Structure formats: structure tokens, C-alpha cells
Amino acid sequence: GTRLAGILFLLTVLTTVLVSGWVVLGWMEDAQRLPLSKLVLTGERHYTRNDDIRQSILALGEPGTFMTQDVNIIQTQIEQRLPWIKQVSVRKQWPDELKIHLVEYVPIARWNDQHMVDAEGNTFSVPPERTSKQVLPMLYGPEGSANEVLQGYREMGQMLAKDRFTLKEAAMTARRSWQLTLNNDIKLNLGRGDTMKRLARFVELYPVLQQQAQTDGKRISYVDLRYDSGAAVGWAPLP
Amino acid sequence: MGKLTLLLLAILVWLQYSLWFGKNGIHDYTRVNDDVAAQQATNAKLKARNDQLFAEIDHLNGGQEALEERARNELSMTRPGETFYRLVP
Amino acid sequence: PLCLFICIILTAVTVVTTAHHTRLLTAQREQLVLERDALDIEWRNLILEENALGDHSRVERIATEKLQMQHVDPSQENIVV
């Protein structure tokens, strides 16, 4: 009498596991085969948009599913289409869910009018519509030396900012010569020699350059600093 | 018995010694790797030193920014219409 | 035992992996010596080309060719620190 109960108690519980396991299998077999049309962008996004990740993930020409999608192929495709992203981390979560973590570059200057450069020296490109609102310095130089010109911009800029100047542009040549551009288009034609001590000479010379420019009603066009304790100043009529 | 174990044990011991020392071993790889690192570091500075000079040589044979600077910095000659200032301590 | 026998395999493979990578660095170390010699020789010929083009008699020759004049003391404004 009691063993029949223990048999039925075990057989029924056995039946309830398989039946519940059968509908759970049906729940997990009709759900794990979906193209994961969802997308979760967790991160501080300033340049990339929600439609950018969607259009780039479908640019492969194939709607991948869950068990038929490599995240290493998605993160690379995002890298090959979005140059302003530093670290892509696309990961799958559940039947119809995705997780993509994005990290952008913070531009502190503009590199050759078409690219930008951050504080760590890294170079990248941003479309001009998403960054025209930014007032950033424009750094010029030969390719591969964005970090070197950045070191010059800071050093020449920190000294120039002491006496309330604004370094708008800083250009460097392949032979390592500098030509700065200040506010109101004041071209400082520096040279290859001691650049910091030439620039420091213009700072001390400027109070006399401006008091003479107002005497004749002229505008400072450019101040050539390629001398030793000397500087030649060009003029231009003011509008 | 233990002789069967002692045989393969001494082989691994001598095989470890031949890995650290000898030819192309660990210490040879370590020493050569340090030399190759220092050489390409020096060659990078030399190539930059040669490229920076070659860039000026490009601007020397009737160029632009390598002949006017020598005229200004070494000969003190200016362009017409430029007021020349001199700073004295 | 046969457990240490596989360590011999793991070590023998490590020897081949270490020897193969080391002989590659030796071939590159020799190539960097040839590169430095080429750079120095290239550096020597460059500094010689600089003097033939940076000669003051030649610099002054072409400086006045593009309308430049020597510094004149009367028209030279002096400023004290």
C-alpha cells in the first residue's frame, strides 16, 4: 500500500518534471532562434547615434541570430565604420537581446582640418556636422606626429595663456619648424631653434608692438621671430 | 620500479637545464631581445634625425622655409616693409 | 610515472618554440646593424649637402633674389628688458 504511493509519488513528480521540461524546452527552442533585433547602448555617446549602430550592424547584409553570430565580427564592423569609437564591446545576453558598450574619443584639438586629436595623442575622424559647434584649436603637422605637435601646443599655449593670449592654430613642418596663429589673425612665424624663448620674446615685445600699431592706424599682420633677440613685424590696413 | 621513474625524471631535469642555458635558449632569447629593442629604439631616433634633415635639404635647394630662416637668423636681413625690433637685457 | 613523461613533451616543444623565435631575433639584430650603418652613411652625405646649400655666400645670393635687404642700424628700433 505504501510502496504504491511512493511509486506514484515518484512517477507523478517524474511526469511533472518531463511535462514542465517539455514546455520549457518548447519555450527555449522557439525563442533562442531569433535575430536579436534589440539593441542596448550603454555608454556616454556624444557623436554616435542610435541609428549609427543599427545601420552599421545591418551593413553586413545579413541578419544574424543568437547561436549564429560572432560578437568579434560585430565589434570589428563597428570599428571599421565608426572612427570616433575607442573600444567596442558587443555582447549577447538572452534570446532576443544584445548589449553594446561604446567609448568615444574626447577631441581637444583639430588635426589638419579633417581629423581630430585627443589628450592622449590618439587620432581619429569625425564628420564636420557633429563637431562644428566645438571651438577647438587647429593643430597642423606631418602625418604621424599629432602627439608631438600636441606637446608643443600645450607648452607654447600655457606660456601664451599666462599673458592672456589665445593660441588658435599651431602648425609644424616635417623639418620641425613652428608657425603659430593667434587671435585677430596674428601670425607668429617661429623657427626651428629655441621656440619657447622666441615666443617668450614676443610676449615681452607685444606691448610695444601694439602701441606703435595704433600710432599709424595699422593692424599687426605677422610677427616673424626667426632672429636672435630680434623680430620683424609686418603690417596691414585695418577694416 | 623506482628506476623506471628515476630514468624519465633525470631526463626532464637535464632538459630544463638545456632550456635555460645553451644556444637559443631562454637566456639567449632574453639577451638578444634586449639588444634588438635598444637598436630599433636608436634607429628610430636616427631615422627621425635623417628625415628631419632631409626635409630641410628639400627646402634648401631653392625651397621656402629653409633659406629665408638662414637669411634672417644668420644674416639678420629682413623683407621690405617690416619694422625690425631688437630686445636688449 | 607517465605523468612526468608529458612534461618532457611540453618542455621539448618549448625548446623548439624558444630556439625558433631566438634565431629569428638574431637575424633581425644583424639587420639592424646594417640599417644603422646605412643611416649613418646617409646622415654623413646629408650634412655635406647642407653646407653646399647653406653657404652664406649662396644664402645671401638667393636671399636678395627674392627682395630682401640687410639690417640697417638707424631703422632698427631697440627695446630694453
Numbering used by the authors:
A (entry chain Q): 22 to 260
B (entry chain B): 1 to 89
C (entry chain L): 39 to 119
What's the paper's own text on this?
The essential membrane protein complex of FtsB, FtsL and FtsQ (FtsBLQ) is at the heart of the divisome assembly cascade in Escherichia coli. This complex regulates the transglycosylation and transpeptidation activities of the FtsW-FtsI complex and PBP1b via coordination with FtsN, the trigger for the onset of constriction. A core complex at the heart of this machinery is composed of three type-II bitopic membrane proteins, the Filamentous temperature-sensitive proteins B, L and Q (FtsB, FtsL, FtsQ). For a long time, the FtsBLQ complex was believed to act as a non-enzymatic scaffold for the assembly of the divisome, but recent studies revealed it to be a positive regulator of the FtsWI complex and a negative regulator of the bi-functional PG synthase PBP1b.
